[PDB]
Design a protein around this ligand. Sequence first.
Ligand SMILES: C[C@H](CO)OC[C@@H](C)OC[C@@H](C)OC[C@@H](C)OC[C@@H](C)OC[C@H](C)OC[C@@H](C)O
Ligand SMILES: C[C@H](CO)OC[C@@H](C)OC[C@@H](C)OC[C@@H](C)OC[C@@H](C)OC[C@H](C)OC[C@@H](C)O
Ligand SMILES: [Mg+2]
Ligand SMILES: [Mg+2]
Ligand SMILES: [Mg+2]
Ligand SMILES: [Mg+2]
Ligand SMILES: [Mg+2]
Ligand SMILES: [Mg+2]
Ligand SMILES: [Mn+2]
Ligand SMILES: [Mn+2]
Lengths: 253, 253
Amino acid sequence: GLTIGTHLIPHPRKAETGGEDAFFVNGDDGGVFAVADGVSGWAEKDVNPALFSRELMAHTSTFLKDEEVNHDPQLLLMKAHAATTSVGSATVIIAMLEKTGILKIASVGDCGLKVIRKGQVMFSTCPQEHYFDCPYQLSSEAIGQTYLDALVCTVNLMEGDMIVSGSDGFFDNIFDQEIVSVISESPGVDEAAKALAELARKHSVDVTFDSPYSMEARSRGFDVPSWKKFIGGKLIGGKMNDITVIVAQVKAL
Amino acid sequence: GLTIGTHLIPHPRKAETGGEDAFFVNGDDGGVFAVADGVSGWAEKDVNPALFSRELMAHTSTFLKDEEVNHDPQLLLMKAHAATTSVGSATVIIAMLEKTGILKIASVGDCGLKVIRKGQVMFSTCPQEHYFDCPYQLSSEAIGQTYLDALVCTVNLMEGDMIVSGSDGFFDNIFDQEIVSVISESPGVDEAAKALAELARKHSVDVTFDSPYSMEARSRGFDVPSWKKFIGGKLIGGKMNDITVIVAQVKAL
Ligand SMILES: C[C@H](CO)OC[C@@H](C)OC[C@@H](C)OC[C@@H](C)OC[C@@H](C)OC[C@H](C)OC[C@@H](C)O
Ligand SMILES: C[C@H](CO)OC[C@@H](C)OC[C@@H](C)OC[C@@H](C)OC[C@@H](C)OC[C@H](C)OC[C@@H](C)O
Ligand SMILES: [Mg+2]
Ligand SMILES: [Mg+2]
Ligand SMILES: [Mg+2]
Ligand SMILES: [Mg+2]
Ligand SMILES: [Mg+2]
Ligand SMILES: [Mg+2]
Ligand SMILES: [Mn+2]
Ligand SMILES: [Mn+2]
């Protein structure tokens, strides 16, 4: 099973309506969770990006009671996506722990999941994108991706392992060593999820912080010329974004 | 199945004996390969540093004919390790493709495996270490790790996926985008394995190349004045090492 804690911090400008990230958690049995990040660009269509991600999570809850798909995260995505009628799009990850400790994962886009064991990250999902900051995404539009495009994987867990999952707003704004440090000094999953989300939030609004996002952008060629890299002029900064964090401790295998 | 190509370049000062990396490949059925990196430093014990990795690979091939373990990389490691009598130690990875396209992996230490799909890395193993450059390792000595310490995972593959695996001598000396670039311009697995190994080799002997190894060391704090003064200068350049590259293309699922 999993002991699961969660925290969400919307982008400051979108806080009034709850942001556009959505999630699902059920820790009653083996342990299951999901995160969906509604894609920011939809406001330009006079479309609320939160409807699609929220509906995707609602249908995930329903299809978890469908015995033909409820042990296969990729097939859960298939059914939840097909049932979603709201206009919009989202990145999404679903993870479920079997009683044997096998964690099954399906991911479309740039949500993420890491496993921390014995003080280090030993498993980390890779984001999918068409180009920088344009993720694979499930959509109301034919141009989007489908369950066939999901990254589908598993990892065998052991008691005491810590799973950390969330949206790109989290991972773009926090380094692996910070995740490990915060986890180590938190007394429980609820406190860990809040402290992790708050640290990412602090970084996300800090224009002076060299975030994973800004480092990654410089690696792609978005950098300024090397002769213009004075202090005050570098391509650095957190990435303001909705932040969703799920922290899950493996128990009773 | 897998179409598999390989290329090995020993450390320039260990070429006469072939270095201390070892590997096994079998592309005749569903596809399986393994890499073991004998740990540098056993030569200080006056121990033949290549014997443990070579023997571990030999026993891996034998236990691939043991029906009790031959569909479980972690159990293959268990048997191969227990059968190895040579003094020494090694990091190791075993990967096995089922006919469904499920790639099963078990890894101890800092060998690595990446999956490249549609022009990007979509899966990447995480190295295990006790501290910087001191990896988890299977050993002749009680202080080493066992199969219970392996990271065990799977990833679902599709036709055309490219698997790139190898020892730390490869991954410490090449960036993911170089791997993707070389794979993109290679007409076959043999050509990719040789081009990848040769590029890593060129980097490994280049004091001017800011290698993944040297960047990682700086991110740990070995560039601070106390550690820089202790080692005698900045930690820079490629990392000289045995280089092993396996490239496998997914076919006929
Ligand atoms: C993934 C790919 C990248 O290759 O692109 C991502 C894309 C999904 O995100 C772009 C999005 C922010 O803009 C949506 C845009 C495509 O509008 C759709 C339009 C054609 O619908 C017409 C029609 C009147 O709509 C009626 C309304 C009721 O739905
Ligand atoms: C058999 C002989 C016969 O005389 O008995 C002598 C015995 C004392 O063996 C010598 C041994 C100490 O040499 C091992 C060393 C050369 O390699 C270091 C590595 C194996 O340990 C790292 C290990 C995982 O990590 C350690 C720490 C980071 O947790
Ligand atoms: Mg969003
Ligand atoms: Mg991104
Ligand atoms: Mg995003
Ligand atoms: Mg070695
Ligand atoms: Mg290393
Ligand atoms: Mg090494
Ligand atoms: Mn986001
Ligand atoms: Mn090596």
